[PDB]
Design a protein around this ligand. Structure first.
Ligand SMILES: NC(=O)C1=CN([C@@H]2O[C@H](COP(=O)(O)OP(=O)(O)OC[C@H]3O[C@@H](n4cnc5c(N)ncnc54)[C@H](OP(=O)(O)O)[C@@H]3O)[C@@H](O)[C@H]2O)C=CC1
Ligand SMILES: CCCCCCCCCCCC(=O)OC[C@H](COP(=O)(O)OCC[N+](C)(C)C)OC(=O)CCCCCCCCCCC
Ligand SMILES: CCCCCCCCCCCC(=O)OC[C@H](COP(=O)(O)OCC[N+](C)(C)C)OC(=O)CCCCCCCCCCC
Ligand SMILES: CCCCCCCCCCCC(=O)OC[C@H](COP(=O)(O)OCC[N+](C)(C)C)OC(=O)CCCCCCCCCCC
Ligand code: SF4
Ligand code: SF4
Ligand code: SF4
Ligand SMILES: [Zn+2]
Lengths: 111, 368, 112, 160, 90, 175, 115, 124, 139
């Protein structure tokens, strides 16, 4: 999931750390200057059929933008549904924000 | 198939769209075309869907059987093959299948009538509705597959409805509709060969006397690939047939020797490989099973068609107009009847029938 | 040297009759003052004129058909790179590295 | 015991040794190793010391996240460890550990870069299965199933 | 030495009252545990509800702000050199 | 030869039950769908680490047998094919043959990143990039490996799909 | 450890004349097993076409002159022979082996994209 | 008008409709990047033919939410310090100069900081 | 835990209607103290019975009677059910809650096997723009 700041702004600054670390090369990122001048991405894809669910992207994120929810019940009928774009990842972040906050408040001190 | 089906990487449709192909022509490549294959879960449909999707062309497959459509998706990459649950009695479902399509191939047709559909409804009503819906969606190309003996004045319901289907399609979609008249097609699990391979073929003296010009099913699907991507084929009629004429009795006896049913002299007669019955009895049995059996059996109309041989319309076009040489049944006969061989199992030596071996076997069959 | 080792390597014939490899020494990046990457000789293949990269319409992925697009061999000497390219029967060409001319540089020259 | 590693020299345990060299002896050894491992686990719980769990070297080990967001040098090391990695001095090694399957070893070749030049993985199951022909000859079919089980074969390890 | 341990000293759910007396009579080895973790002891504070306040542990010689020159502990760049002895040097 | 096709007859998945025969064949489908959903027999086809999580579904903690799930060693006696592991090019012909030997009705489950799209070995010279290149997949289970509950959730999704089958009502209304 | 069926001990032949005999001996073994290849893999072609295919593959290396290359070529041919006779190959591989098939003009490649 | 639905703009010339599925976001009509594909064009694909557009993921546009946050005005200091208002769970701490007579946003959060002496100039 | 006396106690506490619903999906008759409800409508309970085993002290009562879906559990209570914390989301401190600047809607479960399934698409424009043709007449 892709997370937001409490003000609603996206946490990711399109720094492309997660794309470089990813052992399976499951992350595709395209970025540019936003309309207002912010450093933001306009394309953030994760191939869930290619990811090995290893957490390197979460560890490398400097702003905690990309995280892994404790969710596992999202099996899909078609393989296309496992190709997450930015809209799917941002929606997941909004949907699972409360549960992610549970994990962060207990695991952040150990990081 | 080959490695790249299109003759050029840029194609302009009849509706004005410019389509650019990307890639060398593999699974990950694209042709820029989106096609709808009505009846893509049928015998010919699977061949057509496999050829279109293997080169990257987007295929929309309307379907009514949920389990039958699953094997079609393997042909193409992710997002290439799409499915729409449809019924010819649902106008909205048909209009959704052709909304994004540049090519519409109508493979819907039947030789039987059921409790829900008649021969007219599928061969004429379904074709007309698909053709008219395609034009209102601005589809550049429409391909309709009629039968080999399509004739609106024919005494057979199947041939007459196919003949009317050709005319009703051209009126609705327009002069830009291409019509294909394929001969009986031979292939793995082919209906033309399944009847011949059936051990207990009731009334073989009345049914297996029909003479046809069998054509390879892989070539028919290949021909449709040529027609769809070549705008020079619009508005034409294609008769797809083999060079060599065959009678079903010759094929039946030739197959009997390949299967080695005759290894035991008594067995073919005892097992019921010959079931001579009077035609009036076959008519009665076909009439009864039209309302008792829940599965499509040999019906009344097919009994009429046993007396009608395949006649070729000379004015129509052939494989030569598409730059192809028809495959010979003698070359491919062994590989398509091989699964039905009794024992084989590399016991002593497999008897592989080549092109010359099949032709010699034909002489033996006709030798008294 | 003269042995045609490509007959036993197992690589497809297209590597010989259709692809061109470049033997080169990496040039120093204009954004950095390091020269470590310029100490080794490398071999890569010229891109295919068609099908090197195309956009997958489903997700915008960079699709390709060039199987040598991501292969870069490393050599310690120029002679070793030539000997290996000749051994495999590859069609290649050498890009001679540019050498920087030496000019004396002293602080006194800021005024004289 | 032959080449102690990772605090195995600070715990007390015994090794079971068979005599007949058949499957039953190997079953008994693996049951003793069950209890000896439980013996070691108890000592590790009691003797767990305080201190860092990774090397205090931010050029190899990632810095803590809290220190990353406050220290300039921590951010640089965090950035470079995840984008370029850490370079390893040129050379080669053959490191082996007493894996549960047997002797598992890796032959890693370093070229001074951040990516291994060669990584040969030695699988005890790969060597065990190579002796299956020499061991299972003359036995019956159900004995082969026992011999396969007694070798503790995982084919990801074999086919790495 | 890891000798036999009574059942009540093991962190598993056991029997009570008459059902404990019956278990001792019928079981061949009465001191064995049932293997069901204690609901009131095992994982009762979940990892997400721990009250411990974690702090990063740092050693003094290598993690202090003074007397902590990095090259004094730069073992990676002080690796042993690779030396090969041929028949000439031997 | 006049054909008058109705235009607004809903498709089978939307078609309500109007006459008495609709409830008859829907009862026929539900009796079969319940039987196949309840008698969920996968085939023992463990390939790689994904199989370990598949074993823990049969473990006492989850006890797949409580739902009627029994693993069969022969394709003849199994109707569910769970591809749990990496499919290699050397293995792909064997996987296709085993799949073809399963009598109908049959379903295929793709578990783990290897079977879904290749996962860690996507760019390998000897790995198939997704089992769907060989056999049709009915449900994809994500994870590396998917947890024992992740696999059970995928099975529940498939059983939900199976209970919605209308094989015998399709013959009555669609054919 | 006993070697599998039809397994030969790898050897480096230092005589060109001896190498020619070994190739001829292996060439006849391929021809003798042509019918076995048809039976085991259930091919759609007669054994006569298999022998033509075997001859064509052998003729592709007829004019190889370097002796070290001959030893590798002979060794791999022995491995291929062992693979086919022992039915280690799947039937799909052998079918595709015999499923191997005037080039296009400059304009024909140009109009479609070429390579 | 399909011109506001397919062109990147700093502001939407009209009020966004939360029930309109052709907007880029429920709270924003136009896209906010020159390379961002318009949602209306993206949904005009063969794969959306029989798909309900309402249930598709439509997260709110972050560009419209961040500018609803009031400007933070700093008293008796020309430097603003921001770390995400979360500390260890925020972003790396950075220092923003406020000498210029305008609001300057954070490099990570996008929160805008300025001096109180420039409050009148900025608001007008 | 598998005793018939435990079932009889839960049968009495729950009643006929509650227990029969458990006899249709749960394959077990269980009773517990209500902890809260999610936006989708599911009810969550905690069991104080000493005879319950380690991993069976928390359970959900789904809204449906014939079919149950794990994805219908709200993300707020999904973590609590899996024993990730001892504080249910309805017992959360105001500072421990998530702050959303966007509105919140009803929980939406997994949408597979429906018409609402997620359809992937490219969020980026084509990297090259073709020339818009124009005609200028020569003098
Ligand atoms: N030897 C041959 O097979 C010959 C073929 N033809 C014609 O070629 C065309 C292709 O048929 P073929 O593949 O060969 O064999 P089939 O007769 O099995 O193909 C029939 C196709 O049309 C569909 N169909 C029939 N009725 C309906 C209906 N009411 N509603 C929706 N779909 C329907 C079927 O869908 P579904 O499977 O889901 O029921 C199927 O896909 C046919 O029109 C046939 O008449 C003519 C001469 C020779
Ligand atoms: C036991 C009785 C079986 C009668 C089946 C039947 O009569 O089936 C035949 C008809 C026709 O429909 P079809 O089977 O799809 O036609 C295709 C097959 N033909 C063309 C060979 C007929 O169906 C009906 O009239 C259905 C009546 C259902 C009654 C309740 C059961
Ligand atoms: C002894 C064998 C018992 C069979 C049990 C399975 C029946 C079943 O599955 O019944 C399913 C059927 C029909 O479907 P429905 O669920 O009612 O959906 C229909 C939705 N209406 C009600 C709004 C239209 O119901 C019955 O009315 C079955 C009547 C059986 C006499
Ligand atoms: C004679 C041969 C041997 C016996 C075989 C018996 C097999 C067991 C039956 C299958 C069970 C099954 O399928 O019931 C499961 C289904 C649920 O179906 P669903 O898809 O989960 O929901 C879809 C259904 N809605 C939409 C309604 C939710 O329950 C039912 O609808 C039960 C209600 C029907 C009426 C029940 C009482 C009528 C009397 C029935 C007894 C005479
Ligand atoms: S968790 Fe998945 S996406 Fe993230 S770095 Fe690991 S493999 Fe890549
Ligand atoms: S690591 Fe975090 S901030 Fe950097 S690109 Fe990935 S998600 Fe964005
Ligand atoms: S997906 Fe992951 S867990 Fe499953 S087989 Fe592949 S590597 Fe193993
Ligand atoms: Zn900030």
């Amino acid at each position: 999931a892709l997370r937001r700041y409490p003000s609603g702004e996206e946490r990711c600054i399109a720094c492309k750390l997660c794309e470089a670390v990813c052992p399976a090369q499951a992350i595709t990122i395209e970025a540019e200057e936003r309309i207002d001048g912010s450093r933001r991405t306009y394309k953030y894809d994760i191939d869930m059929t290619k990811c090995i669910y290893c957490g390197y992207c979460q560890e490398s994120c400097p702003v905690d933008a990309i995280v892994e929810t404790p969710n596992v019940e999202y099996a899909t009928e078609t393989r296309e549904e496992l190709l997450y774009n930015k809209e799917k990842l941002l929606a997941n972040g909004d949907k699972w924000e409360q549960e992610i906050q549970y994990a962060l408040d207990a695991d952040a001190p150990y990081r | 198939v080959s490695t790249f089906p299109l003759k050029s990487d840029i194609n302009i449709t009849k509706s004005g769209k410019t389509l650019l192909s990307v890639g060398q022509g593999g699974r990950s490549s694209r042709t820029g075309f989106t096609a709808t294959v009505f009846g893509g879960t049928g015998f010919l449909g699977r061949v057509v869907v496999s050829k279109l999707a293997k080169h990257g062309t987007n295929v929309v497959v309307p379907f009514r059987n949920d389990r039958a459509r699953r094997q079609l998706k393997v042909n193409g990459d992710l997002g290439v093959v799409n499915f729409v649950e449809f019924d010819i009695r649902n106008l909205k479902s048909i209009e959704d299948s052709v909304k994004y399509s540049d090519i519409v191939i109508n493979l819907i047709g039947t030789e039987h009538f059921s409790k829900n559909f008649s021969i007219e409804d599928v061969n004429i009503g379904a074709a007309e509705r698909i053709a008219k819906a395609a034009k209102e969606a601005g589809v550049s190309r429409l391909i309709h597959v009629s039968s080999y003996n399509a004739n609106p004045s024919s005494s057979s319901d199947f041939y007459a409805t196919k003949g009317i289907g050709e005319q009703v399609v051209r009126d609705n979609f327009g002069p830009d509709a291409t019509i294909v008249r394929p001969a009986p097609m031979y292939f793995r699990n082919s209906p033309f060969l399944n009847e011949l391979l059936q051990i207990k073929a009731l009334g073989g003296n009345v049914i297996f006397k029909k003479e046809v010009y069998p054509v390879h099913a892989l070539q028919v699907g290949e021909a449709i690939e040529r027609i769809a991507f070549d705008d020079a084929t619009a508005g034409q009629t294609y008769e797809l047939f083999g060079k060599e004429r065959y009678s079903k009795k010759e094929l039946r006896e030739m197959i009997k020797h390949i299967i080695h049913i005759g290894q035991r002299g008594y067995y073919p007669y005892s097992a019921g490989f010959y079931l001579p019955a009077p035609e009036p009895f076959l008519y009665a049995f076909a009439l009864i099973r039209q309302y008792i059996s829940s599965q499509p059996r040999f019906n009344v109309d097919q009994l009429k068609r046993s007396h009608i041989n395949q006649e070729i319309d000379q004015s129509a076009k052939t494989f030569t107009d598409l730059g192809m040489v028809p495959d010979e049944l003698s070359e491919y006969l062994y590989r398509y009847v091989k699964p039905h061989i009794s024992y084989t199992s590399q016991t002593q030596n497999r008897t592989v029938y080549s092109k010359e071996d099949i032709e010699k076997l034909r002489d033996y069959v006709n030798t008294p | 040297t003269d042995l045609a080792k490509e007959l036993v390597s197992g690589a497809p014939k297209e590597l010989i009759t259709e692809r061109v490899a470049r033997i080169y020494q990496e040039a120093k990046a204009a954004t950095q003052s390091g020269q470590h990457n310029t100490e080794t000789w490398k071999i890569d293949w010229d891109i295919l004129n068609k099908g090197n990269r195309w956009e997958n319409d489903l997700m915008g992925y960079q699709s390709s058909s060039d199987y040598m697009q991501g292969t870069i061999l490393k050599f310690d000497t120029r002679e070793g790179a030539i000997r290996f390219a000749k051994g495999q029967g590859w069609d290649y060409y050498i890009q001679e590295p540019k050498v920087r001319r030496f000019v004396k540089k002293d602080y006194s020259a800021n005024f004289y | 015991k032959s080449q102690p590693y990772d605090a195995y020299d600070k715990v007390d345990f015994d090794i079971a040794v068979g005599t007949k060299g058949d499957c039953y002896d190997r079953y008994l050894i693996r049951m003793t190793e069950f209890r000896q491992s439980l013996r070691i686990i108890e000592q590790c719980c009691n003797q767990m010391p305080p201190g860092p769990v990774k090397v205090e070297d931010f050029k190899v080990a990632p810095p803590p996240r809290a220190l990353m967001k406050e220290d300039m040098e921590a951010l640089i090391h965090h950035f470079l460890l995840y984008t370029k990695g850490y370079a390893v001095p040129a050379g080669e090694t053959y490191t082996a550990i007493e894996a549960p399957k047997g002797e598992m070893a890796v032959y890693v070749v370093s070229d001074g870069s951040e990516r291994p030049y060669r990584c040969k993985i030695r699988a005890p199951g790969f060597a065990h299965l190579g002796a299956f022909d020499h061991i299972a000859r003359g036995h019956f079919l159900p004995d082969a199933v026992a011999i396969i089980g007694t070798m503790d074969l995982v084919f990801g390890e074999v086919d790495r | 030495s890891g000798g036999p341990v009574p059942v009540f000293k093991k962190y598993t759910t056991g029997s009570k009252g008459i059902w404990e007396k019956i278990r001792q009579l019928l079981t061949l080895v009465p001191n064995r545990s049932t293997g069901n973790p204690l609901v009131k002891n095992y994982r009762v504070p979940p990892p997400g509800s721990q009250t411990l306040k974690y702090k990063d542990p740092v050693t003094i010689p290598a993690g202090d702000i003074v007397k902590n020159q990095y090259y004094d502990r730069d073992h990676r760049r002080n690796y042993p050199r690779l030396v090969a002895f041929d028949q000439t040097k031997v | 030869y006049s054909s008058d096709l109705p235009t607004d007859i809903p498709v089978l998945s939307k078609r309500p039950h109007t006459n008495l025969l609709d409830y008859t064949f829907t009862t026929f489908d539900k009796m079969k769908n319940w039987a196949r959903k309840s008698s969920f027999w996968p085939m023992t086809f463990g390939l790689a680490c994904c199989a370990v999580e598949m074993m823990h579904v049969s473990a006492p903690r989850y006890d797949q047998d409580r739902l009627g799930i029994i693993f069969r060693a022969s394709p003849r006696q199994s109707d569910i094919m769970i591809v749990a592991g990496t499919v290699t090019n050397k293995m792909a012909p064997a996987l296709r043959q085993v799949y073809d030997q399963m009598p109908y009705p049959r379903w295929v489950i793709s578990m783990g990143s290897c079977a879904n799209g290749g996962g860690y070995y996507h760019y390998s010279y000897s790995v198939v990039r997704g089992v769907d290149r060989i056999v049709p997949v009915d449900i994809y289970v994500p994870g590396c490996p998917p947890t024992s509950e992740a696999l059970m959730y995928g099975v529940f999704q498939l059983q939900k799909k199976m209970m919605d089958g209308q094989t015998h009502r399709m013959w009555y209304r669609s054919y | 450890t006993n070697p599998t069926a039809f397994a030969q001990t790898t050897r480096y032949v230092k005589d060109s004349t001896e190498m020619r005999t070994l190739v001829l001996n292996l060439y006849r073994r391929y021809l003798r097993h042509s019918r076995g290849f048809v039976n085991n893999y259930n091919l759609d072609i007669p054994a006569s076409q298999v022998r033509t295919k075997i001859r064509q593959e052998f003729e592709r290396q007829r004019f190889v002159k370097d002796l070290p290359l001959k030893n590798v070529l002979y060794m791999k041919a022995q491995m291929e022979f062992q693979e086919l006779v022992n039915f280690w190959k799947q039937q799909c591989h052998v079918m595709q082996y015999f499923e191997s098939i005037k080039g296009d003009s400059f304009v024909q490649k140009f109009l479609k994209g070429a390579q | 008008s399909t011109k506001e639905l397919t062109t990147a703009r700093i502001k939407d010339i009209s009020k966004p409709d939360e029930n309109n599925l052709q907007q880029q976001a429920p709270n924003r009509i136009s896209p906010w990047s020159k390379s961002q594909k318009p949602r209306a064009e993206a949904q005009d694909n063969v794969r959306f033919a029989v798909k309900d557009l309402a249930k598709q993921p439509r997260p709110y546009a972050a560009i419209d939410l961040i500018y609803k946050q009031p400007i933070r005005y700093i008293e008796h200091d020309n430097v603003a310090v921001c770390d995400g208002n979360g500390g260890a769970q925020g972003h790396p701490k950075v220092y923003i100069n406020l000498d210029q007579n305008k609001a300057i946003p954070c490099g990570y959060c996008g929160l805008r900081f300025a001096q109180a002496a420039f409050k009148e100039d900025i608001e007008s | 835990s598998s005793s018939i006396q435990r079932t009889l106690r839960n049968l009495w506490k729950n009643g006929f209607k509650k227990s029969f619903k458990q006899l249709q999906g749960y394959n077990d008759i269980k009773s517990g103290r209500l902890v809260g409800t999610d936006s989708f409508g599911n009810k969550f309970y905690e069991v104080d019975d000493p005879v319950e085993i380690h991993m069976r002290t928390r359970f959900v009562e789904y809204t449906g009677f014939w079919r149950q879906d794990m994805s219908e559990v709200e993300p707020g209570w999904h973590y609590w059910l899996a024993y990730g914390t001892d504080v249910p989301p309805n017992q959360l401190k105001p500072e421990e809650k998530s702050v959303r600047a966007y509105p919140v809607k009803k929980h939406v479960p997994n949408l597979t096997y429906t018409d609402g399934a997620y359809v992937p698409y490219n969020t980026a424009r084509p990297k090259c723009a073709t020339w818009d043709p124009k005609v200028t007449e020569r003098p």
